[PDB]
Amino acid sequence: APAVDTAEQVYISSLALLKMLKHGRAGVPMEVMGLMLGEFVDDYTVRVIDVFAMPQSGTGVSVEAVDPVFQAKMLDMLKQTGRPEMVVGWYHSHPGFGCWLSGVDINTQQSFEALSERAVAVVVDPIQSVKGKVVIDAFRLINANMMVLGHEPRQTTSNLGHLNKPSIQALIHGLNRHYYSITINYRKNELEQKMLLNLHKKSWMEGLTLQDYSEHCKHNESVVKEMLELAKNYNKAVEEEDKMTPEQLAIKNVGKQDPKRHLEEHVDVLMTSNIVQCLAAMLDTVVFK
């Protein structure tokens, strides 16, 4: 109804976000799905705390996967731990479909909606988790009566109201005919950060370590030889270069970047090896002694 259905800007925690990406990834092209545990506050704030997953299959998302038995079973575990969580919504991964909600995915979302009125539907892209950009969206179903009278901008009110375009093609077309997409925010905590930042005890000595002379010598030999080749270029280059604009000087002296800059780059690489070795050389001897 336009008079009580608003979109749910989802605050997704580290425990949920990581879980969903990993589960989809291993299964591929077998698709994984599940229920999401979280808490609901406001009339629009859902924090997704944690997730567990439903049965994978080789046809992926289906009606058969969704049974009340799995959910009911989980809830008994929730009591025993003394965790309170109600069900916020459900998730799935589509490697085998785009962000558009497949015909079986809508069926599955309708059942889940009967149980929790406020229900969210999430596409995960496990494939994209391999690369350094990850695109995932959360959505909420829109009612048929709502469209005619209300129109889809009614979900946008009293919340963040960002509406996503996940390129063109099937994904966008399917979005428009089916659901309203709403944004993702990340929940964070200071403690949560601190865990992530932590490295190793071993790195403490790693820097200290006295870099072998042998290895250093390899680097030193490598640096002087490139320098000699470039040195010539440098020598011809300085006869001209009465004008500013360094890129023009790069075409003239030949190649991308000035030969003065090439020589410095090499001097600097050697400098970095040298810095660890010499600092380390005195430092080590004195401290253990």
Binding site: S13, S14, L15, L18, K19, L21, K22, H23, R25, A26, G27, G34, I49, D50, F52, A53, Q56, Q80, T81, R83, S129, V130, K131, G132, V134, E192, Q193, M195, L196, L197, N198, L199, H200, K201, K202, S203, W204, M205, G207, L208, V238, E241, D242, K243, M244, P246, L249, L263, E264, V267, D268, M271, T272, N274, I275, V276, L279, T285, F288, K289
Partner: protein, 288 residues
């Protein structure tokens, strides 16, 4: 039961975050009463990948460390569900939330071994231990010491490091609102690491000395390995030699300085005379 399929234990950032988050969820216990939970992860590999952890409600008293509650029933039922998630997820061992191990931990370990095929007790700490590892991994071993101690069941350390998975690693960057001044990829990062290194060494170094004192008086049982390793460190000592840097960095930099200055010298007369005519023009131009 076997504790075999481990030579290394890598632990995900997920594991730590799950324990602090789960503390609030259960009861808001907060290490008032230490918690043991299942440690989940991969199998059929030499290396142990601890993919995941979930809490089990375990309260151990602070009157007494021999009394605890450990909820067994949860473990069997959670077992069937793990396959729904993925078929690489099985119970590897258990986690202790710290601050430290006990003698009591041997007894907690015998119960958990029935479920697992490769039980290990990995202490994941609710507080991060320093800037180092917030995790230490240990394995139950039957050993004698030539301290005049017959057969004991104790925990000897196995090397711990932090690993990650392709899906998980990306997700971590997005979540992070830190930028990393401790990345350790380059010279800028590398100099920070050296300052910290010295501080790290000092923190570790103190412990070694107190351990030696305890054996001397304030009687503590000698772990023979530790003493054997200590003596090795002092014998390798030599004295330092050479290493230095050239005048070359400067030469290049000076080259850049000449070029601009020559361009400047021709431009100067032109630019400086013109300024007065443009200046006057500007003030009038501005008004409209």
């Amino acid at each position: 039961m076997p504790e075999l399929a481990v030579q290394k234990v890598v632990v995900h950032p997920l594991v730590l975050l799950s324990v602090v988050d789960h503390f609030n969820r259960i009861g808001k216990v907060g290490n008032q009463k230490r918690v043991v939970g299942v440690l989940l992860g991969s199998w059929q590999k030499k290396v142990l990948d601890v993919s995941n952890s979930f809490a089990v409600p375990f309260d151990e008293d602070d009157k007494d460390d021999s009394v605890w509650f450990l909820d067994h029933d949860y473990l069997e039922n959670m077992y069937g569900m793990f396959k729904k998630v993925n078929a690489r997820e099985r119970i590897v061992g258990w986690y202790h939330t710290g601050p430290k191990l006990h003698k009591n931990d041997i007894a907690i370990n015998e119960l958990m071994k029935r479920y697992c095929p490769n039980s290990v007790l990995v202490i994941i700490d609710v507080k991060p231990k320093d800037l180092g590892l917030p995790t230490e991994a240990y394995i139950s071993v039957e050993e004698v010491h030539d301290d005049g101690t017959p057969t004991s069941k104790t925990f000897e350390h196995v090397t711990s490091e932090i690993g990650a998975e392709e899906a998980e690693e990306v997700g971590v960057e997005h979540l992070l609102r830190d930028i990393k001044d401790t990345t350790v990829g380059t010279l800028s990062q590398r100099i920070t690491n050296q300052v910290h290194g010295l501080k790290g060494l000092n923190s570790k170094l103190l412990d070694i000395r107190t351990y030696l004192e305890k054996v001397a008086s304030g009687k503590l049982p000698i772990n023979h390995h530790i003493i054997y390793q200590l003596q090795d460190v002092f014998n390798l000592l030599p004295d330092a030699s050479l290493q230095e840097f050239v005048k070359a960095f400067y030469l290049k930099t000076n080259d850049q300085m000449v070029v601009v200055y020559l361009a400047s010298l021709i431009r100067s007369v032109v630019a400086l005379h013109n300024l007065i005519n443009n200046k006057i023009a500007n003030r009038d131009a501005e008004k409209k």
